[PDB]
Design a protein around this motif. Structure first.
Motif, PDB file in Angstrom:
ATOM      1  N   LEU G 158      28.300  38.477  83.537  1.00 32.76           N
ATOM      2  CA  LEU G 158      29.050  39.071  82.766  1.00 32.76           C
ATOM      3  C   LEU G 158      30.151  39.423  83.226  1.00 32.76           C
ATOM      4  CD1 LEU G 158      26.350  40.817  80.417  1.00 32.76           C
ATOM      5  CD2 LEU G 158      27.013  38.318  80.634  1.00 32.76           C
ATOM      6  N   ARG G 159      31.754  39.173  82.621  1.00 33.48           N
ATOM      7  CA  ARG G 159      32.805  39.354  83.303  1.00 33.48           C
ATOM      8  C   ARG G 159      33.002  41.026  83.330  1.00 33.48           C
ATOM      9  NH1 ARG G 159      37.596  36.966  80.630  1.00 33.48           N
ATOM     10  NH2 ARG G 159      38.811  38.859  81.073  1.00 33.48           N
ATOM     11  N   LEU G 160      33.568  41.539  84.468  1.00 36.30           N
ATOM     12  CA  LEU G 160      33.947  42.837  84.778  1.00 36.30           C
ATOM     13  C   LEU G 160      32.786  43.673  84.476  1.00 36.30           C
ATOM     14  CD1 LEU G 160      36.425  44.411  85.437  1.00 36.30           C
ATOM     15  CD2 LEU G 160      36.570  42.139  85.183  1.00 36.30           C
ATOM     16  N   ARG G 161      32.990  44.876  84.673  1.00 36.16           N
ATOM     17  CA  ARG G 161      31.675  45.861  84.728  1.00 36.16           C
ATOM     18  C   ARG G 161      31.870  46.920  83.400  1.00 36.16           C
ATOM     19  NH1 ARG G 161      33.394  46.964  89.771  1.00 36.16           N
ATOM     20  NH2 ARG G 161      35.456  48.443  89.850  1.00 36.16           N
ATOM     21  N   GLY G 162      33.114  47.665  83.151  1.00 40.29           N
ATOM     22  CA  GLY G 162      33.155  48.623  82.223  1.00 40.29           C
ATOM     23  C   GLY G 162      32.483  49.932  82.603  1.00 40.29           C
ATOM     24  N   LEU G 163      32.728  51.075  82.235  1.00 40.06           N
ATOM     25  CA  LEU G 163      31.918  52.290  82.371  1.00 40.06           C
ATOM     26  C   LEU G 163      31.315  52.578  81.296  1.00 40.06           C
ATOM     27  CD1 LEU G 163      34.650  53.988  84.276  1.00 40.06           C
ATOM     28  CD2 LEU G 163      33.318  52.274  85.315  1.00 40.06           C
ATOM     29  N   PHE G 164      32.041  53.119  79.970  1.00 36.53           N
ATOM     30  CA  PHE G 164      31.485  53.412  78.721  1.00 36.53           C
ATOM     31  C   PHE G 164      32.744  53.746  77.897  1.00 36.53           C
ATOM     32  CE2 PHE G 164      32.697  57.981  78.741  1.00 36.53           C
ATOM     33  CZ  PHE G 164      33.134  58.087  80.045  1.00 36.53           C
ATOM     34  N   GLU G 165      32.643  53.185  76.718  1.00 31.29           N
ATOM     35  CA  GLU G 165      33.577  53.376  75.783  1.00 31.29           C
ATOM     36  C   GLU G 165      32.986  53.107  74.236  1.00 31.29           C
ATOM     37  OE1 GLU G 165      36.493  54.839  74.622  1.00 31.29           O
ATOM     38  OE2 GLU G 165      35.735  55.487  76.653  1.00 31.29           O
ATOM     39  N   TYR G 166      32.396  54.380  73.498  1.00 25.16           N
ATOM     40  CA  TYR G 166      32.342  54.477  72.271  1.00 25.16           C
ATOM     41  C   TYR G 166      32.383  55.804  71.625  1.00 25.16           C
ATOM     42  CZ  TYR G 166      29.177  54.285  68.069  1.00 25.16           C
ATOM     43  OH  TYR G 166      28.594  54.478  66.925  1.00 25.16           O
ATOM     44  N   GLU G 167      33.786  55.932  70.947  1.00 26.74           N
ATOM     45  CA  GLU G 167      33.988  56.911  70.101  1.00 26.74           C
ATOM     46  C   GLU G 167      34.967  56.549  68.970  1.00 26.74           C
ATOM     47  OE1 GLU G 167      34.520  60.392  72.618  1.00 26.74           O
ATOM     48  OE2 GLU G 167      33.707  61.802  71.038  1.00 26.74           O
ATOM     49  N   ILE G 168      35.257  55.375  68.897  1.00 28.93           N
ATOM     50  CA  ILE G 168      36.283  54.831  67.951  1.00 28.93           C
ATOM     51  C   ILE G 168      35.624  54.409  66.783  1.00 28.93           C
ATOM     52  CG2 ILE G 168      38.446  53.720  67.533  1.00 28.93           C
ATOM     53  CD1 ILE G 168      39.066  53.846  70.353  1.00 28.93           C
ATOM     54  N   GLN G 169      35.876  54.931  65.528  1.00 28.94           N
ATOM     55  CA  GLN G 169      35.641  54.461  64.126  1.00 28.94           C
ATOM     56  C   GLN G 169      35.689  52.778  64.116  1.00 28.94           C
ATOM     57  OE1 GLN G 169      36.618  56.774  61.030  1.00 28.94           O
ATOM     58  NE2 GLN G 169      35.285  55.786  59.791  1.00 28.94           N
TER      59      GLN G 169
END
Lengths: 97, 97, 125, 49, 49, 46, 677
Positions: G158-169
């Protein structure tokens, strides 16, 4: 301490003889100054700074003259024996009675 | 006043900076080692000097019980039962008298 | 004019050889209504440590307190007569302590590393 | 009117003074004199020796 | 030469029995109590006025 | 923030005074305890 | 001198889940384990009997009665010998119910649970372990406003890693166009986990040695920067350097220990033994349960709901699973350490629960008074009165108190002396106040010390040993000299008695806590038992002397008169003067006849050396006859020397009070010396 026995009455609380004059003279200067304070001769602080000082000096003069009075006229006063011997009663505590 | 605090820029490998080793602990090794020991001083209070003790059981029964127990458990601390409070806690005989 | 006060001596006497114990702590209950035992703690212990008396302090925490198996044996060796033996296991207070320190996912293990064989003698708790 | 009194023997003067000096929160027992010495030493350690 | 204990000669005469302090004396407990008891004369001495 | 009684009682100056005897007879400059640091084993050897 | 070595130990650490399973799981001979405690069945709505797989599950714990099994049958064992360990259908041992208070429960949460202490408290160790801000991990769980990426063994196609992002409606329907696109479990469940699972996996991933190397490199990089130009820059480097130093400290401690990091995110919850959290059975059906049962019931019920939802995955839902899982996590958080979170849960009385940390921490909880303040047997309160007749090594116990402290020793005295036969018979004889009972409780108490303790203990001398004697009344008689040692007055006070049972303890009490070898205070070394008010006044009045000067004579003694004056010395000779007693005992005898008063002066011959404290002084008047007589008169004594020999005429002016005090001290010494051989 039994055969001799000791007890506290009303005339064993021996006020020093000169208190009659010292308190009377202390009242005179408090009467004169409080009478001149209404004349503008002195300000409020001076009246405050003196009414604390006569009665402190007079009270501390009777306290220091207590034992010399007791130790020369009535060496065996029940209040004197109780406190001077170190059994119970400060010099300050006797000064209250 | 018996423990020094290893000041910053004193990393080496034996004493991490920020450590609070004893005065003899530092002055005996400084006479032998040659790194940047670099301690300064601590006049630890009567409360803080008891939290930095050789036995975690005694500290845990004084103040900040949860923090002391958590840190001791995470580190895996060992108490050698040389004081008087720890042996009382365990019900064992105290090594005095 | 002398009065008589309500704090009478017969309302303050006490005495207890044995009897009821608490369900959990296994100690004499309380006061006089429940036939409890007098409490010793903090400063009292500091006095006993000051005098350098170890057996006296020891037997006020193990024998006359929490020990389930030792109160019965002192009762037995005191009805009949013998030399009172020093206990081995820790009082039930330490057992309860290790119990609720187990409930928080933490250990507390005793050990008795021998001075003549270096053999670990871990107690069971 | 303002008068200066003249007490100021010292802030705390019993158990609280003993508690303050024993509990070394900030080193201020005689730090009007002691802190000067300590800082002077800590800055003057680097010398010929 | 230690901070976790003390010596008989690095302590001195025992104040309770007029001799060298004996081995196994809880001098740490004695020091704490004797400087704590007085603390209440800073009260008891005020418990007359 | 404090009643500076000051009353200097048993203080000492912020200078190089009392070198050989630091504070009464407290710490003489040894120069015999620690040449052996390099003499008993190797420090002066290099 | 080789000392008596004694090596003891006390370790502490986080437990592995296998350790908890071995603690709690009990396997029956049929092969079942059943340690999970599935249902939150505290007690039957029926008879107050608990239930299988419940808070008081007898199947996992011991029997509620000694010998009685779950069904009700009883097996006689009484021994550690050949007996069925399990009663077949019951599967319950017949040993005592002690095992009830020691058996450990165990539950499984179908979600990893982060320990409260290591995550919520001040500088949480998780933040230092992951080198991540506390807000990031606090959003990974609890708030759940994150989606962590665990870097682990599995490849990262799976491309790249990311860390965390879930706060946007917008993310409700924004990512689904980009997310999944090929199955659901084959993308979402491969990686990018949420909740405590990702945190635990990350804990199980990073290598400690690489962390040490990287943090050392960061420390070296930070140390080689001057800065010292901006206050923000002044204080920014220090916090980061301290962070790095505590990071390597924790990592190095982890490396060389038997503790794994993954254990801080626990998965299996131990359960406290039932008997230590009992439900009080009162008459009429009243129950005084424990709040611990309430939080436990809530936790297991929510965990059961989690298991029901997860095992019924099929049509997999979205935010509902997360909501219920994090509710379970919050419930476990409340159970472990309540009152430390933002919102403390309260029971049906607007009151917060007593959390496990609340029991552990507090001046009334554990580690403070349960392990230190212990009520003891052989103890009894009383009231204190003053006894002046008691010796220094003696106290006085009431007849009612003594019989309830030395009861068992009296049972000895009755059984051994063959005045009674059985324990019940002896106790019956005790209960009827037979006249021979007191002869026993006057016979076993002689030589058995008792520790008297003043309830408001202040100093070291607040507890002292004494030799009790039987007094008639209801109050304890105490020696007056030791009162200031106890700081005890007699306006109404209470004293607790204790009896040392062990022979060693009796030796300690007799030889170390008696008020004849503890006569000095440890403060500066000053006497602790000195004559106080009444005795002090008595001694002062005794040693007060006569009336010195004008208080003894109205007129001056110069007064040239009363000389019996004439040209010769043959006149009336009264010369009352003062008595000339031979020695002490003559003076006491003459005082007993009321011949002289206490302060009446007298002359006493001296047959010793000089004892009265004198000084530079001066002899007032020394008369000298034409023949050698050396009549010397000092301030308080008279010396008649001569020109030949025998200077023995020493006479002392004194009063009977001083003689009495000196005789008292002297005869006390010479009586103690000869009494003790």
């Amino acid at each position: 301490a039994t055969a001799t026995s000791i007890s506290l009455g009303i005339d064993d609380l021996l006020t020093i003889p000169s208190k009659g004059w010292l308190v009377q003279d202390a009242e005179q200067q408090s009467l004169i100054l409080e009478k001149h304070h209404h004349y503008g001769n002195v300000h409020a602080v001076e009246k405050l700074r003196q009414s604390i000082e006569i009665w402190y000096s007079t009270s501390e003069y009777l306290r220091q003259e207590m034992n010399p009075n007791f130790r020369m006229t009535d060496p065996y006063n029940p209040v004197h024996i109780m406190s001077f011997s170190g059994a119970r009663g400060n010099v300050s505590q006797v000064h209250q009675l | 006043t018996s423990k020094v605090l290893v000041s910053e820029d004193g990393m080496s490998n034996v004493f991490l900076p920020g450590e609070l080793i004893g005065l003899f602990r530092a002055e005996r090794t400084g006479r032998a080692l040659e790194e940047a020991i670099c301690y300064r001083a601590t006049l630890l209070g009567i409360t803080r000097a008891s939290l930095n003790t050789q036995s975690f059981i005694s500290e845990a029964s004084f103040q900040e019980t949860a923090r002391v127990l958590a840190k001791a458990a995470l580190r895996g601390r060992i108490d050698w039962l040389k004081g008087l409070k720890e042996n009382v806690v365990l019900g064992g005989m105290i090594p005095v008298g | 004019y002398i009065l008589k006060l309500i704090h009478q001596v017969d309302d303050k006497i006490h005495g207890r050889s044995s009897g009821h114990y608490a369900l959990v702590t296994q100690q004499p209950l309380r006061g006089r209504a429940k036939q409890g035992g007098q409490r010793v703690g903090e400063m009292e212990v500091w006095a006993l440590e000051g005098f350098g008396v170890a057996h006296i302090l020891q037997e006020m925490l193990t024998y006359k307190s929490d020990h389930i198996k030792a109160r019965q044996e002192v009762l037995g060796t005191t009805i009949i007569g013998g030399t009172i033996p020093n206990p081995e296991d820790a009082p039930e207070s330490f057992r309860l302590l290790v119990r609720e320190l187990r409930s928080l996912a933490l250990e507390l293990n005793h050990f008795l590393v021998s001075e003549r064989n270096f053999q670990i003698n871990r107690m069971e708790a | 009117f303002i008068y200066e009194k003249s007490r100021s023997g010292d802030i705390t003067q019993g158990l609280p003074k003993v508690e303050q000096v024993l509990e070394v929160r900030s080193i201020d027992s005689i730090s009007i004199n002691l802190e000067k010495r300590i800082d002077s030493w800590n800055e003057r350690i680097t010398r010929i020796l | 030469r230690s901070a976790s204990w003390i010596c008989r000669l690095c302590y001195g005469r025992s104040p309770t029995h007029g001799g060298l302090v004996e081995l196994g004396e809880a001098v740490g407990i004695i020091a704490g109590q004797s400087i704590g008891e007085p603390g209440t004369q800073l009260t008891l001495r005020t418990f007359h006025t | 923030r404090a009643a500076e009684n000051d009353d200097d009682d048993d203080w000492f100056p912020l200078d190089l005074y009392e070198a050989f005897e630091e504070m009464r007879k407290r710490n003489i400059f040894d120069v015999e305890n620690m040449y052996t640091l390099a003499d008993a084993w190797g420090w002066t050897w290099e | 001198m080789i000392d008596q070595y004694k090596h003891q130990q006390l370790r502490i650490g986080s437990v592995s889940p296998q350790q908890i399973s071995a603690w709690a799981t009990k396997i029956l001979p049929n092969g079942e384990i059943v340690g999970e405690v599935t249902k939150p069945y505290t007690f039957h709505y029926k008879t107050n009997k608990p239930e299988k797989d419940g808070l008081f599950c007898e199947r996992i714990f011991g029997p509620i009665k000694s010998g009685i099994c779950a069904c009700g049958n009883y097996r006689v064992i009484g021994d550690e010998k050949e007996d069925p360990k399990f009663c077949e259908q019951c599967g319950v041992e017949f040993v005592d119910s002690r095992i009830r208070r020691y058996q450990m429960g165990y539950i499984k949460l179908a979600c990893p649970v982060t320990h409260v202490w290591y995550l919520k408290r001040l500088p949480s160790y998780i933040a230092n372990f992951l080198d991540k801000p506390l807000k990031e991990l606090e959003g990974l769980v609890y708030c759940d406003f994150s989606f962590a990426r665990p870097i682990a063994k599995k490849p990262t196609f799976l491309r790249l890693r990311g860390l965390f992002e879930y706060e946007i409606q917008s993310w409700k329907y924004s990512i689904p166009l980009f997310f999944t696109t090929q199955g659901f479990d084959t993308f979402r469940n491969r990686e990018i986990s949420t909740g405590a699972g990702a945190i635990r996996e990350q804990l199980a991933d990073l290598d400690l040695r690489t962390i040490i190397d990287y943090s050392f490199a960061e420390w070296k990089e930070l140390g080689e920067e001057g800065s010292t130009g901006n206050e923000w820059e002044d204080r920014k480097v220090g916090r980061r350097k301290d962070f790095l130093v505590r990071r390597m400290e924790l990592v190095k401690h982890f490396i060389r220990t038997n503790i794994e990091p993954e254990w801080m995110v626990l998965c299996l919850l131990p359960v406290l033994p039932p008997e230590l959290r009992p439900i009080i059975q009162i008459d009429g059906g009243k129950l005084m349960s424990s709040d611990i049962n309430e939080l436990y019931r809530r936790v297991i019920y929510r965990n059961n709901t989690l298991t029901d939802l997860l095992s019924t995955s099929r049509s997999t839902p979205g935010e509902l699973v997360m909501c219920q899982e994090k509710l379970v996590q919050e419930a476990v958080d409340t159970l472990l350490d309540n009152g430390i979170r933002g919102q403390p849960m309260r029971d049906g009385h607007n009151k917060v629960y007593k959390s496990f940390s609340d029991v552990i921490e507090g001046k009334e909880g554990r580690f403070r008074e349960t392990l230190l303040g212990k009520r003891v047997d052989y103890s009894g309160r009383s009231v204190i009165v003053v006894g002046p007749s008691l010796s220094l090594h003696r106290c006085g116990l009431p007849r009612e108190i003594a019989i309830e402290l030395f009861q068992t020793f009296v049972i000895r005295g009755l059984i051994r002396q063959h005045l009674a036969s059985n324990i019940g018979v002896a106790k019956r004889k005790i209960r009827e106040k037979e006249p021979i009972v007191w002869k026993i409780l006057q016979e076993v108490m002689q030589g058995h010390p008792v520790l008297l303790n003043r309830a408001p203990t202040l100093h070291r001398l607040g507890i002292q040993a004494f030799q009790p004697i039987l007094v008639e009344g209801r109050a304890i008689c105490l020696h007056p000299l030791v009162c200031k040692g106890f700081n005890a007055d007699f306006d109404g006070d209470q004293m607790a008695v204790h009896v040392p049972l062990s022979l060693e303890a009796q030796a300690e009490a007799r030889l170390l806590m008696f008020s004849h070898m503890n006569l000095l205070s440890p403060a500066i070394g000053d006497p602790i038992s000195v004559p106080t008010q009444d005795m002090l006044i008595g001694l002062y009045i005794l040693t007060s002397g006569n009336r010195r000067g004008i208080c003894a004579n109205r007129y001056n003694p110069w007064n040239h008169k009363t000389y019996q004056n004439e040209r010769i010395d043959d006149t009336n000779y009264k010369s009352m003067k003062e008595p000339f007693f031979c020695n002490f005992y003559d003076a006491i005898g003459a005082y007993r006849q009321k011949r002289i008063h206490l302060d009446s002066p007298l002359w006493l011959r001296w047959q010793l050396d000089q004892r009265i404290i004198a000084s530079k002084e001066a002899p007032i008047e020394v008369h000298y006859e034409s023949l050698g007589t050396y009549h010397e008169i000092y301030a308080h004594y008279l010396i008649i020397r001569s020109v030949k020999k025998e200077i023995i005429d020493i006479y002392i002016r004194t009063t009977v009070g001083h003689i009495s005090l000196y005789r008292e001290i002297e005869e006390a010494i010479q009586g103690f010396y000869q009494a003790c051989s």
